[PDB]
């Protein structure tokens, strides 16, 4: 409350350090549904279905240019991607399987780097 803080967590490294992790996601072979936004022109249903279009290139614009206020709202857009993977994909497809297996990549990279 006011004049009474918790402890300075220090976030000097988080930028750098998300960044890494991005980078990993985006050299993953399964990550090639999710390098580029969805073609709403293209894909019958998406715009209408997904109010929150995301993909791995948008939110490393975002990175690069300060549009994360910090690191919760960075990881919100990364599960934000296979989130939406999953309300438009069955399980049993090749795409909806590389959500599964690209999320479980995610948050063991998050735990190990952060908690």
């Known amino acids: 409350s006011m004049s009474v803080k918790k402890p300075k967590r220090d976030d000097s490294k988080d930028l750098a350090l998300c960044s890494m992790i991005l980078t990993e996601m985006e050299t993953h072979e399964d990550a090639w549904p999710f390098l580029l936004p969805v073609n709403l022109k293209l894909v019958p249903g998406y715009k209408k279905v997904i109010k929150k279009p995301m993909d791995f290139s948008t939110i490393r614009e975002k990175l690069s240019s300060g549009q994360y206020p910090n690191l919760e ?22 795409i909806g399987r590389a959500g599964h297996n690209m999320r479980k990549y995610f948050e063991k990279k998050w735990t190990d780097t952060f908690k």
């Open 73 to 94: 709202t960075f990881a919100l857009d990364v599960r934000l991607v296979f989130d939406n993977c999953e309300t438009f994909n069955e399980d049993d497809s090749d």
